[PDB]
Ligand binder design. Structure first.
Ligand code: Q6T
Length: 167
């Protein structure tokens, strides 16, 4: 049993809810929240800007030190950093950004990072301002992630379309 409430069950391991991932993280304090990161960990907008704002920019300060030491992530890659006030840990995952021309096949590699964690609160990778089709992102998630993933979908309209169209 875990703390997640109000989710619709899609599969054995994937759950979905219409929710602001920031408000959800603040309520649940999950072990792992996933950030929709870029390779520079520049948390300007979308999910990353919202998560970082909720940490009062502490996420960005920590991220800048990580990049100064390690250099940029790979598209499809990840790193584990602090969850600050939102979670124990933040798994920063880089899905391909279609609005930069990145290979959508890298979305499966991105979701494979989730399998290193037993339970996660996450957004749909490469959705929103990363430009991918969220229906596709949900299918890759279901077909890739084997650990227990609680997906937060901010837009109610999109949430209802994802549920209604789910195979
Ligand atoms: O997927 C998004 O575009 C998004 C952007 C910001 C915050 C969020 C989101 O979904 C969960 O909560």
């Amino acid at each position: 049993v875990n703390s997640f409430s109000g989710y619709l069950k899609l599969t054995d391991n994937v759950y979905i809810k219409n929710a602001d991932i920031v408000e959800e993280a603040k309520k649940v304090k999950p072990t792992v929240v996933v950030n929709a990161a870029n390779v520079y960990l520049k948390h300007g907008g979308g999910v990353a800007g919202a998560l970082n704002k909720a940490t009062n920019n502490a996420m960005q300060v920590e991220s800048d030190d990580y990049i100064a030491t390690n250099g940029p992530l790979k598209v499809g890659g990840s790193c584990v950093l602090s969850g600050h006030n939102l979670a124990k840990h933040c798994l920063h995952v880089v899905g391909p950004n279609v609005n930069k021309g990145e290979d959508i096949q890298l979305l499966k590699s991105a979701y494979e990072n989730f399998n290193q964690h037993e339970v996660l609160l996450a957004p749909l990778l490469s959705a929103g301002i990363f430009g991918a089709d969220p229906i596709h992102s949900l299918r890759v998630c279901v077909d890739t992630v084997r650990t227990n993933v609680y997906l937060a979908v901010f837009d109610k309209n999109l949430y209802d379309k994802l549920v209604s169209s789910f195979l």
